[PDB]
Structure formats: structure tokens, C-alpha cells
Amino acid sequence: KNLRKQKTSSRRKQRKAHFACNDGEKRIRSSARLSRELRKEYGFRTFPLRTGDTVVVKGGKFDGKEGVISKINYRDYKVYIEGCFVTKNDGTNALVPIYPSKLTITKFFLENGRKEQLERKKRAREHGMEILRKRQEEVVSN
Amino acid sequence: KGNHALPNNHFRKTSLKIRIHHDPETKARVMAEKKLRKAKALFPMPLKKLRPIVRCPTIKYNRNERLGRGFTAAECEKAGLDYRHARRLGIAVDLRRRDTNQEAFDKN
Amino acid sequence: GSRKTALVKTRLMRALKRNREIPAWKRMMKEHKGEYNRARRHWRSKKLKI
Amino acid sequence: KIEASALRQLGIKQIEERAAEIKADLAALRQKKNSGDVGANDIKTAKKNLARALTVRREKILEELVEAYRGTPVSKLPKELRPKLNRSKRRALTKTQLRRKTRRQRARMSKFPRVIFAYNE
Amino acid sequence: SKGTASFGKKNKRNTEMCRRCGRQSYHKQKNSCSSCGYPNPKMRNPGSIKARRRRTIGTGRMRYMKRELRAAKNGHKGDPILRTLW
RNA sequence: CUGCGUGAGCGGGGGUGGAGGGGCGAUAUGUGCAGAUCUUGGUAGCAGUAACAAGGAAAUGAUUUGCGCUGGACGAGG
RNA sequence: UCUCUGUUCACGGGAUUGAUUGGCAUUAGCGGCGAUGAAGGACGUGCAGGAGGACGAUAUGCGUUGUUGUUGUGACGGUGUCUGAAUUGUGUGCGGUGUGCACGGGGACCCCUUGGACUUAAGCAUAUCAGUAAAGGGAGGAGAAGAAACCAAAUGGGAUUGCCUGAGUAGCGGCGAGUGAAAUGGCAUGAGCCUGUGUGGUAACUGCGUGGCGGGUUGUGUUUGUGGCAGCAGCGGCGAGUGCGAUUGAAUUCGGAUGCGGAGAGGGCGAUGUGCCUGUAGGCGCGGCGGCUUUUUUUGUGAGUAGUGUUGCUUGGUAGUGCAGCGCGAAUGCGGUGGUGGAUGCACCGAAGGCUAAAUAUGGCUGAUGACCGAUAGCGGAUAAGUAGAGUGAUUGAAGUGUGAAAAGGAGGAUGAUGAGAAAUGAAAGUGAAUGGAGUGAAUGGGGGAUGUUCCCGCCCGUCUUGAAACACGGAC
Ligand SMILES: [Zn+2]
């Protein structure tokens, strides 16, 4: 019951697939982009997020801050970062939720089997960039 | 009231039904894909059969020719062939028709 | 009455342990505030029909 | 939490007596819940441990029978070892029984076999 | 006295719960359900146009028919153990 | 609040509001309300009116005293 | 003070403007239940749980495999209390005591049986509505039909099914109201076969079983596909290219730059978007499931039928167009048909046994679309809706969407805090408070003049009617 590769271009069907998909698809729609200096080691652009990653905010009142993710809520599209808070009417602090597509990944987390997820996708991309080169260079003759 | 032709519109039955296909352009091209898919499943053989030339019956259509159903067993025999073997070569055979004209027998 | 069949007794028991309000630990949550059960029955107004 | 892989090395009667031990510590957890003295994840994991031991026990009873009947055709297996397809897909003739012809009828077709030709233009 | 005063005599109950359909319409002196027709082997013809959409295929749980529909999309392969015999 | 038009109607100014809105030509219509003992929703007068209740008392009321007549069990129904 | 009437602020109610994980329509595919126990019903299952949803004593979920570190989830396999056809039964085949099959659910579309009345004829009985609705029995992804005992009148065509023309025509009809074909011509799709009389130098045949039993001379006659050819659906993964300045609570706005494009479809993000994310164009990988495809020499037949007298129904079929009951009941160089009853020429065909793709119909499910509706609309149903509730029962059946970008926070009052903003917008009917003017005249209107009035004119609208201000009817707002 995955829905993010729908053929339809109907507005009601697309908003329905964003707000009501399963939790597996909520994580891929919560994807972030890598920095320039981290995108020279791995070849790819965006990768999804988890706790422990270091990011940087871009736009809003926390524009320019940097911190570590302390909690994620995939179902509601909410990320909590250490250092972006507010004081309630009691003296206490609370963390503010941010939307995942306004962050940039720098120095992610590599401990619970995540070092291999990055290496599997780095191989699939360079294998796919050669099917395109062989086709292109031969279609160069085409 | 008035001077008009007397009307004869038959809509007195509640059981009557209306029928409309609202998109005949997509219905034609879905049937041309069916027709090209049979053709390359029979691939070497051409999906249509050879049919004879016949003559329209009455005095109104007397002077007109036409494609008919199939050849007869005598027309197949004189062309050097058996009608059981003409059917394996893409030729249609009709054993109901009778032979009564010598010019038409020769065109076929 | 005191006399009743076995099947009448087990449906009266099921109806009995249904007539209850939302528990307090669930109402105290952040995303369940302002919720009441609203499927409640009082023995004088509405009848169960056996 | 005991693994499904860990129980796949025991025998049929070793699993059956391992399932009787899980029944005992569920009986003790049921008494501590009456005292308001039970953890928040204790009864659930013991109850899921017993569902694992019962699915692995049916997998081993079914491997005894796949050896007892190695050659019997599908019609001659016990009715609870035959495939459950559909009532309608069970009532239908086979593909062999659909293209069969009488002996007199395919003698009339021997002299006129099939030909492969191609019409061009 | 055919109005208010006649209502105080209505304490006998003619029906009980039907064991096929679960309504209070199994008439005990008649031995017959007025909703579903039990104990006839077939179910009764519904009495109205709306009555057909209150109790049909899909208004309950469909515990088996859902499973069978997921199996017919994959060719009815069964338990992987028993597949050797077949 | 104010200008234009015989009229159906069309403009501008100051508050309020917090996200979209129009002109001109052809074209498609579920295209304009005061009434139908019209349909659904809300609200007046009547009117603080009709009707109903205010059960004998003793600063207190587990104590003292005055009045009424159904009282106690099994079944149906709850 | 009270009554009427200006002005400002506060109520009361939920119209209007703008939104929408809902509805509705057309189109392409599919049409997948059950004695191997279905659909439906009852009762149960969470450490702390009522409704809904989910689940079955393996119970708020278990196994394998993929993706994940998470309140985790996708694809497939297993389990499934007590009931219900509910059957430890009834009927029946093959055997000879073993082993099969049927029953119920659904029924839009299809086949067979039975069979109305409202209505039209300006009345009504034949007629019409209509062999239609309702009822019952039997099937499938379609079904039924089908290879001339045909059509015709030429120099003839050549199985079935659908569409256009023929044609509102030929005809039927209290010749009234009405009703109503076909052949030819033009297109779509195209396909033809099996049997009851098969050896006699030996049943050459097959259901069960491992060289045998059962059947059969009152007549059996049944090899073969992990191979090829064509197609259809699904799953997984890779997928190009960005930075400054001004306004803002926040920019996709405005102003300079710099790139991609077989990708400038659509959606989300604090607001109006080609380089912020998802996808998109386009390549790769992996299952699965079907259709075609193997041809020893054979000759000959269809009876309580066809027909027909009588009786009832039906059709445009007119003096049978077709069907049925009852009674009579055929032929073998012979039998049937040719829009008027019968005769005779000529023409054209072989009934009373069996099977057959494609082009056609259609609730629901899944994909894709739209000059469709926007909360009194659209499905009854944008929410714990066939629910809450009503009825002895068969049945019947609603009303209810919106704090904010963020909970950053309130909820007797007062004092305050947060926020861009106290927080969707907030019409009329009607009301309270203050303040200006008028009155003891039912009020309200037009002319002419004026910071209320003084002069003149003026009965309440709509409707039927010769005729309404009417003691004519409808109308509190
Ligand atoms: Zn019942």
C-alpha cells in the first residue's frame, strides 16, 4: 500500500498520500540534504534522518543554528534539536519542532548498523552511473 | 392545434432504454491494438483469408460485383488443388455455393 | 427477576461492563483532552430489550 | 525473549516440555498482577514466548509426515495434506483432458498437416 | 378503556433471541423467526429495498474471504513446507 | 460615510478583517423571490402572565412533642 | 421614569467570503465464496481501557523475507472459541462396505417457469400499459445462439451475434387510441467439427490395483510437452542541477547574479516556486501466471416423431406467425418449403441426436480522467452512520467540519504572561447601557420646504372576479 509513485496528478490523491501513508513512507518523505564537504565522499544527495545526527537550520528564527537531533516524530513530521527552545510561563524550557526539509546534514551517526546503509547506496549509484555512461557514449554514436 | 404533420413519437413504454458510448475515439484505438496483437501471434500467416468475387442478386443490383464468402470445390480442383489442402494455405472454401456461370467460374 | 436463563444472564453482564467513562490516565494525556465517552446508558431512560 | 531459531534445534518432545515451563511462570505472573506488583512488560513477553513455541511445534510435526509420504500422488494423500486452491479450481478438467481427440478423428487429419507460409504484398 | 388503561396489561413476551441472526424476532408459539426465516435452510427474502443493504456480504467481518483474495493474486501457493509433496 | 446613472446597478474614502481578487470578446447554464395553511433554522409580543410547589412545631435537632395510612412475602416486567 | 425615534459601545444568532484525507459522473481492465465447513450472528482478548477500529485461548497479534532503531512498518505464509447449509443428516453414483458427489451465500447483466394493476382511449368492457413489475427455479466471466428440411426470383446470394440504411414503411387495430417487422445494400468480427451399422487369422477397448480384479459381444475402441514460439501483470532499486541584498511574525514576493533539462506533471514546506524535500523523464534487476504448438484407412441411418381435427395462449403475420393439452397418427427412387384457401408445373433444400472461439450486455472492485457539488449542496452518511433513537413485528432512521506557523495558554472575578494577532470571519431579526430630540396624536409615505411637527395629497398587499379597503381567502418577524 505504498503510494509515493502514483501515476495520477490529481490534487486530492496527492495530499491523501502525504498525510496518511504508512510509517515506512513517512521516513523517506522526511529526507534531508547533505553538505558540500560531505557530498564529495559519498556521491549522492539527500539521505534520511535519525537521532544523533548533526544538522544546521536554514530560515526562520533559528536560522543559522547548529545542534544534534534529540528526537524525531516521523508521523507528524517534527524534529527536535538541542539548543532551540522557549521558556514557558513557569521558568521551564521546551524544545521547538522544526520541519525536516529545512535542515542540512553534517557529520551523521554511524553505530546501529548505519555505516552499511551508506555503503550500500554508494555502490548502487556508481553502478547506475555506468549504465548511463555506456548507453550515452554508445548513443553518442547514435 | 395548428396545421402540422401528425406526430408519431413512440415514448409510451416505461421499460424503454437509452444507450450511448461517450468516448468512441479511445474505443477505436483500443480495438486496433487488439488487431495488431493477433497479427504477430499468427506471425508468418496474414490473419485474413482470400475470398472470391461474386454478383449481387436482384435486378436493382445486377450490375455490381462484390467479395463473397468462399470458393467452391470445383474452382479449387481446376486450379490444381484439393479443398482440404486449400484451407491450410489461407483460402476460404464454401461448399454451399453452386456453379452456374462459366465466365465467373474463370475469374475465380 | 431472580429467575433468568443462562443466555439472558451473560448478555446482561456484557452490557453492564460497558457502561463506563474514559479512564483518567487517558484523559490526562496531551492529545486526549476534552474527551468523554458519550456512549452512556441510564436504566430509567433507555431500555436494553432483554 | 527466547528466539524461534533457538527452539528449532530441540525435538518434538523437548519443545512440548519447554512449553510447560512457560505455563508455570505465567501462573506466577498472574498472581503478582493481583497484588499490583507486576512490571509493565512482563506478562506480554511471556505470552508471546508461548506463541513462538507452538508454531515451531507444528513445523516439526509436519516434517515427520513429508517423509512418511514421499511418492504418493496428490489424489492419494490424506485430505488434510492436499492443496487448498478453490472449490472451483478443484472441480475443473485438466489441460490434458481438454485437448484430447478420438482416434478416428485424427486419422482424417493425417494427410493434411499444417503449413508455414508468408504472404508478401 | 381501550387507551391508557389497556397498556397496563402488556407484560407477556412472545419472542426470544434468534440463534441464526440475533434479533428479538423468533416467535416461540409459531417456531419461526420473522426476520431471517429460521429454521428454513434458506434465508428469507428481504421485505424492503433498504433491508437488502443492512445485512449482506461486507456488512460483517469477512474472516475467510479476505484471506482467499490475497491468495488468488499469487497463484495459490500454500505452506512452503508442504510444497514438496505437490 | 460619499460620487455617477431615468432605472436594473456601478465606483471612491475611514474603521474591521488576514488571503487572494478582477476588466473586455465568444461559449456553457441547477442564472435574479415578498407571498405557495411553502421547506429547514433562529427570534419577538403575549408575560414574569396561566399552571405547579411552599408538609405541625421546639436558637440547636442521633433528643422532646403533633399528624397520615397502606404494612410483609412469591411470580411477570426492570 | 414610561412610549416612539437619532448616535456610539456591548450582547444574541450563525448568514456571507475563503478552504476540504468527502461525494458524484464518464472511461479502461477484472468479476477471484462454500462439507478442505462459506456469508452472517453471539461472546471474549491490552500491566494500567469505555466507544470505534483491529484480533481469536498461538486473541490490542505469531513465523519467513525486505526496509529499519522506530508509537516501527511492507509483501507473503500459519492460527482462528461457540454458532450458522450446520449434517453422527437426507438423496444418490461406483463398488460390495469402502469411497465420492449434491445442499447454503450472491443474483446488476444471462437462460427457463409463472404473471398484475395504476395508466391511455378525455366515460368503458376488446385493445393499451405489457409478456413489462413483483414471485420462483438454474448458470458464468459473460450467457444464450450457431454451420440451411434458409433467403429468393438475378448473369443470383450463402452459419451465429452487434451497428447504420430500409422505416414509423409493408402490415395488425371498437381500421379508434394506438402498434409495428424483415430481406437486399454498407460496416465490425470471421471457423468449423463429433456421433448411433469399425476386425473375425481370435476386444484390436478401458475404471481400479501392482504379470491381476470390475465392466463389456443387448458392442468397448481415451499416447505424448521440465521443448518451443508469442504475450500479460507485479515487485525492487538508481535518478540532473544554488548563492547573496531589501520588506515580513515567517517568504515561493521585489532586486543583482549562477546552473540543469529525454526531467518546467502534480503535492508538502511559517505566504504567490525550474535548481529546499518528494517525486517526474529515462535506463537497469527480479518473480509469477497464461494462450498457440504433437493428428494410423474407415461406411450407410435419427418415430408415439412429423403431420392433422378440436380447445386455450401468443405474433406485424393478415384464412397458424409460433407454442401447448386431448384425440387420431405417416413415407423409402421418398420427404419438406416458395407472406390468401385449394390444384398442378418449375425452383430451392434434408427436420425430428451432440459440441463450437471472436465481434454484444452489465450492480460491484481496481486504475485513469472531469466546462460536476463545496457543509440546508454532494451519497442517508466530509466525525465512535445504517450509528443514536422509534416500533410486538415486517420495518424505520437523524443532527453535528475550522485556536495557532508553533502549546509557546488560558477556562469564578481582578491583576497579568505569551503571540504578528487573544485567536477563523461574524449579516439580519431582537435586546442591554449611556447620551441627544420628541410625545399623550395609531404609526408609516409622496409634493413643497427645513437641524422633529404646522399647508396639500394619501384606506393593505398578493389573488379569483362583472365588481375588493372589504363583515372574501393567504400573510407575527
Ligand atoms: Zn433470525
mmCIF file of C-alpha atoms (C1' of nucleotides) in Angstrom, chain G residues 37-240:
data_model
loop_
_atom_site.group_PDB
_atom_site.id
_atom_site.type_symbol
_atom_site.label_atom_id
_atom_site.label_comp_id
_atom_site.label_asym_id
_atom_site.label_seq_id
_atom_site.Cartn_x
_atom_site.Cartn_y
_atom_site.Cartn_z
ATOM 1 C "C1'" G G 37 -17.223 -26.115 6.938
ATOM 2 C "C1'" A G 38 -18.854 -20.004 3.477
ATOM 3 C "C1'" A G 39 -21.622 -15.221 4.145
ATOM 4 C "C1'" G G 40 -23.908 -13.739 8.543
ATOM 5 C "C1'" G G 41 -24.511 -13.939 14.259
ATOM 6 C "C1'" A G 42 -23.087 -14.408 19.763
ATOM 7 C "C1'" C G 43 -19.273 -13.956 23.417
ATOM 8 C "C1'" G G 44 -14.385 -12.884 24.541
ATOM 9 C "C1'" U G 45 -8.656 -10.784 24.009
ATOM 10 C "C1'" G G 46 -4.310 -4.692 26.243
ATOM 11 C "C1'" C G 47 0.055 -4.451 33.235
ATOM 12 C "C1'" A G 48 -2.870 0.252 33.779
ATOM 13 C "C1'" G G 49 -9.349 0.797 28.598
ATOM 14 C "C1'" G G 50 -15.306 2.710 27.694
ATOM 15 C "C1'" A G 51 -16.781 3.648 22.119
ATOM 16 C "C1'" G G 52 -14.680 2.719 17.135
ATOM 17 C "C1'" G G 53 -11.193 0.005 14.702
ATOM 18 C "C1'" A G 54 -8.209 -4.325 14.875
ATOM 19 C "C1'" C G 55 -7.731 -9.532 16.628
ATOM 20 C "C1'" G G 56 -9.360 -15.398 18.274
ATOM 21 C "C1'" A G 57 -7.451 -19.343 24.025
ATOM 22 C "C1'" U G 58 -0.869 -19.055 19.122
ATOM 23 C "C1'" A G 59 -6.684 -13.385 20.927
ATOM 24 C "C1'" U G 60 -4.991 -4.988 21.072
ATOM 25 C "C1'" G G 61 -1.437 -10.333 17.361
ATOM 26 C "C1'" C G 62 2.795 -15.342 15.853
ATOM 27 C "C1'" G G 63 6.657 -17.156 11.529
ATOM 28 C "C1'" U G 64 9.679 -16.224 6.893
ATOM 29 C "C1'" U G 65 11.675 -12.428 3.965
ATOM 30 C "C1'" G G 66 12.730 -6.845 2.712
ATOM 31 C "C1'" U G 67 13.381 -1.982 4.877
ATOM 32 C "C1'" U G 68 14.541 -0.004 9.778
ATOM 33 C "C1'" G G 69 16.106 1.732 15.559
ATOM 34 C "C1'" U G 70 11.435 3.283 15.395
ATOM 35 C "C1'" U G 71 4.439 4.629 18.845
ATOM 36 C "C1'" G G 72 8.359 0.800 13.896
ATOM 37 C "C1'" U G 73 6.419 -0.821 9.086
ATOM 38 C "C1'" G G 74 5.727 -3.525 3.549
ATOM 39 C "C1'" A G 75 4.948 -8.150 0.910
ATOM 40 C "C1'" C G 76 3.610 -13.275 1.675
ATOM 41 C "C1'" G G 77 2.556 -17.985 4.965
ATOM 42 C "C1'" G G 78 0.209 -20.064 9.665
ATOM 43 C "C1'" U G 79 -3.754 -19.921 13.673
ATOM 44 C "C1'" G G 80 -8.987 -18.949 14.036
ATOM 45 C "C1'" U G 81 -13.779 -20.066 20.931
ATOM 46 C "C1'" C G 82 -19.209 -21.188 20.459
ATOM 47 C "C1'" U G 83 -22.594 -20.964 16.345
ATOM 48 C "C1'" G G 84 -24.624 -20.835 11.347
ATOM 49 C "C1'" A G 85 -26.290 -25.116 4.907
ATOM 50 C "C1'" A G 86 -24.965 -26.979 10.205
ATOM 51 C "C1'" U G 87 -25.111 -32.585 8.768
ATOM 52 C "C1'" U G 88 -23.272 -38.522 13.906
ATOM 53 C "C1'" G G 89 -28.410 -35.700 8.428
ATOM 54 C "C1'" U G 90 -31.351 -36.628 3.839
ATOM 55 C "C1'" G G 91 -30.987 -38.108 -1.519
ATOM 56 C "C1'" U G 92 -27.919 -40.526 -4.958
ATOM 57 C "C1'" G G 93 -23.173 -42.826 -8.323
ATOM 58 C "C1'" C G 94 -19.205 -46.570 -8.245
ATOM 59 C "C1'" G G 95 -18.124 -50.593 -5.583
ATOM 60 C "C1'" G G 96 -19.759 -54.612 -2.476
ATOM 61 C "C1'" U G 97 -18.741 -51.747 2.918
ATOM 62 C "C1'" G G 98 -15.202 -48.929 1.039
ATOM 63 C "C1'" U G 99 -15.101 -44.104 -1.214
ATOM 64 C "C1'" G G 100 -17.260 -39.897 -3.999
ATOM 65 C "C1'" C G 101 -20.985 -36.064 -5.284
ATOM 66 C "C1'" A G 102 -25.468 -32.520 -4.274
ATOM 67 C "C1'" C G 103 -27.452 -28.845 -0.288
ATOM 68 C "C1'" G G 104 -26.049 -22.590 1.549
ATOM 69 C "C1'" G G 105 -24.367 -17.345 0.047
ATOM 70 C "C1'" G G 106 -24.985 -13.821 -4.006
ATOM 71 C "C1'" G G 107 -28.282 -12.817 -8.266
ATOM 72 C "C1'" A G 108 -26.589 -5.748 -11.988
ATOM 73 C "C1'" C G 109 -26.181 -8.380 -16.650
ATOM 74 C "C1'" C G 110 -27.960 -14.076 -18.843
ATOM 75 C "C1'" C G 111 -31.496 -18.850 -19.552
ATOM 76 C "C1'" C G 112 -36.318 -21.319 -18.137
ATOM 77 C "C1'" U G 113 -41.353 -21.001 -15.397
ATOM 78 C "C1'" U G 114 -45.317 -18.034 -13.676
ATOM 79 C "C1'" G G 115 -47.714 -13.417 -14.187
ATOM 80 C "C1'" G G 116 -50.551 -7.997 -12.292
ATOM 81 C "C1'" A G 117 -52.911 -3.386 -11.618
ATOM 82 C "C1'" C G 118 -52.152 2.023 -11.732
ATOM 83 C "C1'" U G 119 -52.220 4.263 -16.585
ATOM 84 C "C1'" U G 120 -54.032 5.882 -22.157
ATOM 85 C "C1'" A G 121 -58.572 5.570 -25.040
ATOM 86 C "C1'" A G 122 -60.851 12.962 -22.422
ATOM 87 C "C1'" G G 123 -66.538 7.642 -19.970
ATOM 88 C "C1'" C G 124 -65.676 1.987 -20.648
ATOM 89 C "C1'" A G 125 -65.894 -3.822 -21.412
ATOM 90 C "C1'" U G 126 -61.849 -5.977 -26.742
ATOM 91 C "C1'" A G 127 -57.408 -3.039 -27.057
ATOM 92 C "C1'" U G 128 -53.238 -0.169 -24.373
ATOM 93 C "C1'" C G 129 -49.592 -0.082 -20.173
ATOM 94 C "C1'" A G 130 -47.021 -5.406 -21.312
ATOM 95 C "C1'" G G 131 -45.424 -10.785 -21.580
ATOM 96 C "C1'" U G 132 -43.295 -5.336 -18.522
ATOM 97 C "C1'" A G 133 -43.103 -5.069 -12.378
ATOM 98 C "C1'" A G 134 -43.343 -8.377 -8.286
ATOM 99 C "C1'" A G 135 -42.570 -14.026 -7.148
ATOM 100 C "C1'" G G 136 -39.968 -18.914 -8.118
ATOM 101 C "C1'" G G 137 -36.106 -22.450 -10.315
ATOM 102 C "C1'" G G 138 -30.872 -22.837 -12.872
ATOM 103 C "C1'" A G 139 -25.763 -20.879 -14.674
ATOM 104 C "C1'" G G 140 -20.928 -17.802 -15.888
ATOM 105 C "C1'" G G 141 -16.980 -14.087 -16.631
ATOM 106 C "C1'" A G 142 -20.143 -13.346 -19.773
ATOM 107 C "C1'" G G 143 -24.534 -16.154 -21.140
ATOM 108 C "C1'" A G 144 -27.811 -17.685 -24.917
ATOM 109 C "C1'" A G 145 -27.295 -18.614 -30.316
ATOM 110 C "C1'" G G 146 -24.888 -21.216 -34.423
ATOM 111 C "C1'" A G 147 -22.680 -24.400 -39.831
ATOM 112 C "C1'" A G 148 -29.677 -24.136 -44.105
ATOM 113 C "C1'" A G 149 -35.825 -29.720 -44.413
ATOM 114 C "C1'" C G 150 -32.553 -20.954 -45.472
ATOM 115 C "C1'" C G 151 -33.424 -16.462 -48.367
ATOM 116 C "C1'" A G 152 -35.241 -15.621 -53.050
ATOM 117 C "C1'" A G 153 -36.912 -14.926 -58.476
ATOM 118 C "C1'" A G 154 -30.778 -12.301 -60.752
ATOM 119 C "C1'" U G 155 -25.724 -13.232 -65.149
ATOM 120 C "C1'" G G 156 -28.320 -14.874 -58.170
ATOM 121 C "C1'" G G 157 -26.582 -14.942 -52.784
ATOM 122 C "C1'" G G 158 -24.634 -18.458 -48.691
ATOM 123 C "C1'" A G 159 -23.576 -20.498 -40.088
ATOM 124 C "C1'" U G 160 -24.441 -17.331 -35.481
ATOM 125 C "C1'" U G 161 -24.036 -12.253 -32.909
ATOM 126 C "C1'" G G 162 -23.751 -6.344 -32.897
ATOM 127 C "C1'" C G 163 -24.372 -1.250 -35.516
ATOM 128 C "C1'" C G 164 -26.284 2.200 -39.768
ATOM 129 C "C1'" U G 165 -29.765 2.310 -44.002
ATOM 130 C "C1'" G G 166 -34.533 0.048 -45.454
ATOM 131 C "C1'" A G 167 -38.676 2.894 -41.986
ATOM 132 C "C1'" G G 168 -42.518 4.915 -38.447
ATOM 133 C "C1'" U G 169 -42.518 1.828 -44.046
ATOM 134 C "C1'" A G 170 -45.436 -3.456 -45.514
ATOM 135 C "C1'" G G 171 -48.996 -4.599 -42.414
ATOM 136 C "C1'" C G 172 -52.202 -5.502 -37.382
ATOM 137 C "C1'" G G 173 -56.126 -2.379 -34.914
ATOM 138 C "C1'" G G 174 -64.208 -0.814 -31.129
ATOM 139 C "C1'" C G 175 -59.264 0.254 -39.328
ATOM 140 C "C1'" G G 176 -60.263 4.012 -32.882
ATOM 141 C "C1'" A G 177 -56.470 5.436 -29.423
ATOM 142 C "C1'" G G 178 -52.562 3.277 -30.821
ATOM 143 C "C1'" U G 179 -48.978 -0.563 -32.527
ATOM 144 C "C1'" G G 180 -45.065 -2.353 -35.945
ATOM 145 C "C1'" A G 181 -41.118 -6.283 -38.748
ATOM 146 C "C1'" A G 182 -37.721 -8.486 -42.451
ATOM 147 C "C1'" A G 183 -34.766 -9.367 -46.999
ATOM 148 C "C1'" U G 184 -31.322 -6.778 -50.069
ATOM 149 C "C1'" G G 185 -27.154 -2.820 -49.809
ATOM 150 C "C1'" G G 186 -22.943 -0.705 -46.314
ATOM 151 C "C1'" C G 187 -19.623 -1.877 -41.980
ATOM 152 C "C1'" A G 188 -17.365 -4.785 -37.389
ATOM 153 C "C1'" U G 189 -15.713 -9.931 -36.409
ATOM 154 C "C1'" G G 190 -14.738 -14.237 -39.009
ATOM 155 C "C1'" A G 191 -14.018 -21.388 -38.170
ATOM 156 C "C1'" G G 192 -15.763 -25.330 -38.362
ATOM 157 C "C1'" C G 193 -16.458 -30.309 -36.392
ATOM 158 C "C1'" C G 194 -18.229 -35.242 -33.456
ATOM 159 C "C1'" U G 195 -21.532 -39.491 -33.477
ATOM 160 C "C1'" G G 196 -25.882 -44.244 -33.288
ATOM 161 C "C1'" U G 197 -24.296 -50.172 -38.889
ATOM 162 C "C1'" G G 198 -15.228 -50.149 -37.335
ATOM 163 C "C1'" U G 199 -11.649 -56.703 -37.004
ATOM 164 C "C1'" G G 200 -13.240 -62.240 -37.166
ATOM 165 C "C1'" G G 201 -6.456 -65.464 -38.903
ATOM 166 C "C1'" U G 202 -9.184 -64.702 -32.245
ATOM 167 C "C1'" A G 203 -11.899 -56.683 -27.942
ATOM 168 C "C1'" A G 204 -7.606 -54.750 -31.626
ATOM 169 C "C1'" C G 205 -11.030 -51.301 -25.674
ATOM 170 C "C1'" U G 206 -10.881 -49.265 -20.744
ATOM 171 C "C1'" G G 207 -12.317 -47.620 -14.480
ATOM 172 C "C1'" C G 208 -9.358 -49.640 -10.036
ATOM 173 C "C1'" G G 209 -4.572 -52.016 -8.437
ATOM 174 C "C1'" U G 210 0.611 -53.966 -8.869
ATOM 175 C "C1'" G G 211 2.304 -60.474 -14.858
ATOM 176 C "C1'" G G 212 -4.441 -59.332 -11.850
ATOM 177 C "C1'" C G 213 -9.871 -57.770 -10.395
ATOM 178 C "C1'" G G 214 -14.516 -54.909 -12.268
ATOM 179 C "C1'" G G 215 -17.189 -53.645 -16.788
ATOM 180 C "C1'" G G 216 -18.164 -55.086 -21.962
ATOM 181 C "C1'" U G 217 -20.387 -59.001 -27.727
ATOM 182 C "C1'" U G 218 -28.176 -56.385 -25.726
ATOM 183 C "C1'" G G 219 -20.923 -53.793 -28.678
ATOM 184 C "C1'" U G 220 -15.885 -51.200 -25.839
ATOM 185 C "C1'" G G 221 -12.321 -48.589 -29.302
ATOM 186 C "C1'" U G 222 -9.083 -42.207 -24.462
ATOM 187 C "C1'" U G 223 -0.386 -41.904 -26.268
ATOM 188 C "C1'" U G 224 2.544 -37.710 -25.581
ATOM 189 C "C1'" G G 225 5.263 -31.078 -23.673
ATOM 190 C "C1'" U G 226 10.896 -29.832 -17.095
ATOM 191 C "C1'" G G 227 10.674 -28.161 -25.666
ATOM 192 C "C1'" G G 228 9.454 -24.411 -28.192
ATOM 193 C "C1'" C G 229 7.030 -19.832 -30.013
ATOM 194 C "C1'" A G 230 4.071 -15.156 -28.941
ATOM 195 C "C1'" G G 231 2.094 -12.185 -24.914
ATOM 196 C "C1'" C G 232 0.107 -10.078 -19.787
ATOM 197 C "C1'" A G 233 0.654 -8.327 -14.877
ATOM 198 C "C1'" G G 234 3.775 -7.378 -10.370
ATOM 199 C "C1'" C G 235 7.901 -6.338 -7.218
ATOM 200 C "C1'" G G 236 12.859 -3.735 -6.043
ATOM 201 C "C1'" G G 237 16.409 -0.219 -6.788
ATOM 202 C "C1'" C G 238 19.431 4.178 -9.179
ATOM 203 C "C1'" G G 239 17.659 9.012 -10.836
ATOM 204 C "C1'" A G 240 20.343 16.044 -13.041
#
